[PDB]
Amino acid sequence: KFPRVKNWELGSITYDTLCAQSQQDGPCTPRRCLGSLVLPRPPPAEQLLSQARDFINQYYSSIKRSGSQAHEERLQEVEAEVASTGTYHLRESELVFGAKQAWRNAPRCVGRIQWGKLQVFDARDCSSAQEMFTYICNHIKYATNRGNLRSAITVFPQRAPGRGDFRIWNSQLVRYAGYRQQDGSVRGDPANVEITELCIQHGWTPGNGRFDVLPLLLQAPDEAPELFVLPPELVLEVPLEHPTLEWFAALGLRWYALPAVSNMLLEIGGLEFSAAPFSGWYMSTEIGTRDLCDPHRYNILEDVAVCMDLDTRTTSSLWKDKAAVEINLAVLHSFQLAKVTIVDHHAATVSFMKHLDNEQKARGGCPADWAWIVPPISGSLTPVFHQEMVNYILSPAFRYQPDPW
Amino acid sequence: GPKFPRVKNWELGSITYDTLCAQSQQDGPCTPRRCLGSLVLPPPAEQLLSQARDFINQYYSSIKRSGSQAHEERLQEVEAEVASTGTYHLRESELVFGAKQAWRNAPRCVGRIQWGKLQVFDARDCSSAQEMFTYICNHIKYATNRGNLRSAITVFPQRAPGRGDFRIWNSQLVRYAGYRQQDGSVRGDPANVEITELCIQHGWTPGNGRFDVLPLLLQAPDEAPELFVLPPELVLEVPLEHPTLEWFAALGLRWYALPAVSNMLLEIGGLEFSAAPFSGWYMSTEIGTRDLCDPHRYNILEDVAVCMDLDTRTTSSLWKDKAAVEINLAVLHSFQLAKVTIVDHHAATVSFMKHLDNEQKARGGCPADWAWIVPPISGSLTPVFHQEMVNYILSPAFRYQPDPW
Numbered sequence: 123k124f125p126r127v128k129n130w131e132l133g134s135i136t137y138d139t140l141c142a143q144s145q146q147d148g149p150c151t152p153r154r155c156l157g158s159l160v161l162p163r164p165p166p167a168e169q170l171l172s173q174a175r176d177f178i179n180q181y182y183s184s185i186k187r188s189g190s191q192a193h194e195e196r197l198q199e200v201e202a203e204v205a206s207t208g209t210y211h212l213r214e215s216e217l218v219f220g221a222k223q224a225w226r227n228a229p230r231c232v233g234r235i236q237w238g239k240l241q242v243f244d245a246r247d248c249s250s251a252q253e254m255f256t257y258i259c260n261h262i263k264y265a266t267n268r269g270n271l272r273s274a275i276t277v278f279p280q281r282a283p284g285r286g287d288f289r290i291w292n293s294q295l296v297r298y299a300g301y302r303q304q305d306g307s308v309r310g311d312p313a314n315v316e317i318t319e320l321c322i323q324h325g326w327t328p329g330n331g332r333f334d335v336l337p338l339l340l341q342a343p344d345e346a347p348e349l350f351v352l353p354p355e356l357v358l359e360v361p362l363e364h365p366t367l368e369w370f371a372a373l374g375l376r377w378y379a380l381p382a383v384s385n386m387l388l389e390i391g392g393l394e395f396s397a398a399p400f401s402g403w404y405m406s407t408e409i410g411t412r413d414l415c416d417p418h419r420y421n422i423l424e425d426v427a428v429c430m431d432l433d434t435r436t437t438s439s440l441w442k443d444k445a446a447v448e449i450n451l452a453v454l455h456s457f458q459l460a461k462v463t464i465v466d467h468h469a470a471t472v473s474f475m476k477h478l479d480n481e482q483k484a485r486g487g488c489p490a491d492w493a494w495i496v497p498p499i500s501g502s503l504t505p506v507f508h509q510e511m512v513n514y515i516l517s518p519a520f521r522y523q524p525d526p527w
Numbered sequence: 528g529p530k531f532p533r534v535k536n537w538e539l540g541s542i543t544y545d546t547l548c549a550q551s552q553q554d555g556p557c558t559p560r561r562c563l564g565s566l567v568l569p570p571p572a573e574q575l576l577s578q579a580r581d582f583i584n585q586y587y588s589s590i591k592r593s594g595s596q597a598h599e600e601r602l603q604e605v606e607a608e609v610a611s612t613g614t615y616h617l618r619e620s621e622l623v624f625g626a627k628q629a630w631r632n633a634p635r636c637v638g639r640i641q642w643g644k645l646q647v648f649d650a651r652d653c654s655s656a657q658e659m660f661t662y663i664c665n666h667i668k669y670a671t672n673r674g675n676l677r678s679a680i681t682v683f684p685q686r687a688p689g690r691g692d693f694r695i696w697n698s699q700l701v702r703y704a705g706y707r708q709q710d711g712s713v714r715g716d717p718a719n720v721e722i723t724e725l726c727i728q729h730g731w732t733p734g735n736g737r738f739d740v741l742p743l744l745l746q747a748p749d750e751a752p753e754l755f756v757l758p759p760e761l762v763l764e765v766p767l768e769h770p771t772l773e774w775f776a777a778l779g780l781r782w783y784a785l786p787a788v789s790n791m792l793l794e795i796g797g798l799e800f801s802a803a804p805f806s807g808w809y810m811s812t813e814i815g816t817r818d819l820c821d822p823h824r825y826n827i828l829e830d831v832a833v834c835m836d837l838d839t840r841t842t843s844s845l846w847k848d849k850a851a852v853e854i855n856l857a858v859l860h861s862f863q864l865a866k867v868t869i870v871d872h873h874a875a876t877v878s879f880m881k882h883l884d885n886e887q888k889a890r891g892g893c894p895a896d897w898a899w900i901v902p903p904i905s906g907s908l909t910p911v912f913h914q915e916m917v918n919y920i921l922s923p924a925f926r927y928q929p930d931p932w
């Protein structure tokens with residue numbers, strides 16, 4: 123029934139009872155495990171109503187007023203609206219609780235110890251792409267806070283039956299352009315070649331650098347997306363330098379301060395918010411290891427290794443490993459020097475272990491995706507590597523959705 | 528699309544579908560409700576017959592005589608033998624095929640590109656613990672081959688109804704003792720404290736070093752295990768030194784050349800070989816990262832970092848990452864200098880990607896455990912991190928079994 127969960131470094135054991143609350147299926151079956159796969163392969167009134175009731179029940183339990191008079195009336199309100207219109211609307215307080223629970227429930231997030239502190243901006247009164255842009259600029263300004271980053275989420279209008287969705291085409295609010303060139307090489311970020319081309323197609327005059335901030339493509343229901351350029355002063359960037367390798371700064375690398383996912387769907391009580399960008403702060407390995415070292419991304423490993431005069435002739439000199447460590451150290455040093463919030467992978471995983479213990483006491487478990495929680499470098503040097511994890515889907519939740527184009 | 532799991536490589540953008548998983552006849556630990564992929568450890572003549580028929584079918588398919596008169600005759604011979612004795616026995620060629628397939632099918636082994644090159648030593652005529660020791664010493668001599676390691680497996684008699692099992696109590700043929708200290712600490716390998724104590728309880732006079740090779744505790748059917756000391760000349764070890772850090776040699780670290788798992792059960796056609804030690808050669812991270820750096824093992828990170836004069840007072844200095852890389856480099860360098868076979872994690876993972884492609888063409892897939900295939904350091908710097916994997920159980924197989932005590 124309840125899975126037994128062991129930590130091999132400490133020998134401690136726990137049982138996950140929270141998974142019993144999962145009402146949505148994952149990709150695995152007794153025949154085969156697909157845990158390492160990245161992506162998965164009006165609604166029934168009864169179904170929506172059951173999801174709504176469960177959520178409202180979650181909400182009243184959180185404010186210690188379960189079964190109260192307020193609880194009963196709210197349940198009747200939801201019942202009334204769904205029966206007459208096929209859908210319903212959340213009160214702002216419920217939306218706030220819901221957004222925090224969705225973060226708390228995200229199996230792939232190692233930063234969940236911060237779940238209770240989230241600034242929620244209600245943007246459900248948005249009726250145009252231009253209004254979306256204003257809300258997004260205010261989100262960025264509040265979240266960045268001159269380097270003292272604050273977690274936030276802005277929630278745009280929910281999906282509605284037979285009507286197009288509000289969407290942000292960009293995968294993050296701040297991303298660097300990727301320009302395809304003659305022989306097929308890429309200047310900038312290869313991961314963003316498609317969005318860059320769409321921006322150009324929608325009238326953007328492209329730059330030609332390696333770190334050009336992309337404009338936003340915002341879309342209101344059933345209308346073509348509109349292009350908006352972020353005011354440079356709102357986008358805080360950090361030039362990268364190394365504490366002892368004087369020549370590193372000359373590589374001309376930099377990264378933006380604010381990580382802000384904008385392509386995920388927020389589901390709360392059966393309602394779906396197709397545009398609900400959220401942001402916290404970076405864990406250093408995201409930039410130092412994946413963005414800068416992935417072979418299909420900036421792929422700077424060899425350049426740095428050569429500068430360090432390492433032997434790139436064979437794998438056994440571990441030049442890739444050495445270069446990677448220095449690049450991650452540069453990221454940490456640079457953000458600290460620029461006074462911009464960032465967390466290293468050791469600190470982040472240590473806090474996640476504390477989060478697991480807190481949740482075991484609070485809810486009897488914590489859904490977690492081991493392959494995503496363990497950092498991309500120095501995996502076993504962190505406590506999470508030695509910790510067995512149980513992965514499952516709880517609601518409220520953040521989920522992937524199809525690209526709008 | 529195809530009704531089989533779709534598998535993507537995110538570095539290359541390539542896609543394959545796994546059709547081999549359709550051949551699995553044993554369920555794993557996952558369900559649609561929750562994934563337990565990160566967990567380490569999650570006869571009826573009628574049942575035995577089905578497993579035996581499947582295996583014989585696999586064997587005749589491998590030699591391209593499926594459906595032949597010989598295939599049908601062998602199936603009848605197995606049914607007749609099980610009918611009158613309750614079990615059956617494998618032909619020499621069937622055992623060789625079976626042992627190679629068990630390795631080929633092992634989801635947690637990154638060295639499977641070598642699967643077709645396994646020397647299978649038949650020891651099914653073994654009748655005493657003394658003879659088991661002779662077979663084991665012969666395995667070690669052949670496999671070590673003075674540093675030019677050769678993959679091998681020695682198969683002792685299968686389990687038989689009502690009769691005791693043949694068992695090797697040690698987890699590996701070569702392991703270092705772990706001595707619990709007065710203050711509660713451990714001198715040596717913390718992972719081997721239990722087996723060490725059992726050896727002492729069975730008459731072994733312990734040493735007092737950090738790298739004392741343990742004696743073997745061998746068990747013949749229905750007899751107390753017997754103690755055997757391995758002749759030092761047969762156990763090849765490698766003193767550890769670093770290519771540029773001259774003081775590393777002074778730490779007095781060392782490791783053995785031969786990795787030889789001895790506590791796993793080899794299952795072929797329903798038959799169970801409780802004692803079937805196998806050995807290949809080490810991937811450097813096994814020693815440099817797990818054995819030497821795990822907190823619950825030798826735990827030498829701080830010692831090395833202090834010698835490197837790193838800032839061990841803060842996580843952001845990445846002292847653990849820096850020390851781990853140098854320790855792994857020392858292991859590679861030392862084995863190479865000693866002319867002892869070893870493979871670095873970059874070379875091993877590249878060879879495994881080739882294996883995946885070979886198996887896609889040969890069998891339509893390859894069961895693989897992502898959490899185990901991705902190395903413990905520099906995960907995303909290797910190609911396997913970016914490769915989705917499907918995990919499932921195929922037989923013949925190597926399985927864990929309960930400790931004999």
Ligand code: HEM
Pocket residue numbers: 221225228230231232233234236240273274275383400401402403404405408465470494520
């Ligand atoms: C406070 C600092 C935070 C830290 C350090 C943190 C860190 C991380 C990291 C390292 C990842 C993996 C990213 C990747 O590899 O692509 C991640 C994923 C995720 N985080 Fe957090 N996070 C933070 C705040 C937030 C906030 C504020 C939310 C939402 C309210 C959130 C929701 C998620 C979700 C949904 C994912 C999975 C996204 C995906 O599947 O691509 N995180 N986070």
Ligand code: HEM
Pocket residue numbers: 626630633635636637638639641645678679680805806807808809810813870875899925
């Ligand atoms: C030829 C060189 C080989 C290399 C480099 C290699 C490497 C590895 C590595 C790195 C692991 C993970 C070990 C751990 O983290 O505990 C592993 C696991 C495994 N290997 Fe291989 N292997 C080789 C040969 C073999 C042979 C000859 C067999 C059997 C005939 C084999 C059977 C397995 C099995 C069953 C596991 C899983 C063990 C467990 O679950 O604890 N390997 N191998």
Ligand SMILES: N=C(NCCC[C@H](N)C(=O)N[C@@H](CCN)C(N)=O)N[N+](=O)[O-]
Pocket residue numbers: 293294381382383384385400401402403404405408
């Ligand atoms: N630290 C965060 N990390 C998640 C966002 C950055 C991540 N490294 C990334 O590049 N995510 C892709 C994932 C696309 N599926 C994106 N949204 O563009 N988030 N945060 O709120 O603090």
Ligand SMILES: N=C(NCCC[C@H](N)C(=O)N[C@@H](CCN)C(N)=O)N[N+](=O)[O-]
Pocket residue numbers: 698699786787788789790805806807808809810813
């Ligand atoms: N490379 C191998 N690795 C597996 C053996 C060494 C591994 N690092 C290890 O310590 N395995 C534990 C497994 C504990 N479940 C043992 N048997 O003592 N095997 N080989 O045949 O080449």
Ligand SMILES: C[C@H](O)[C@H](O)[C@H]1CNc2nc(N)[nH]c(=O)c2N1
Pocket residue numbers: 158159160493494495537912913914915916
């Ligand atoms: C194939 C594999 O699932 C994929 O490369 C995953 C592994 N772990 C990850 N972990 C994090 N945090 N982020 C990622 O993008 C990935 N990618």
Ligand SMILES: C[C@H](O)[C@H](O)[C@H]1CNc2nc(N)[nH]c(=O)c2N1
Pocket residue numbers: 130507508509510511565566567898899900
């Ligand atoms: C809890 C987690 O499954 C555990 O620490 C695993 C992870 N991956 C591993 N991978 C390998 N090769 N060997 C191991 O012992 C482990 N341990």
Ligand SMILES: [Zn+2]
Pocket residue numbers: 150151154155156157557558561562563564
């Ligand atoms: Zn699974």
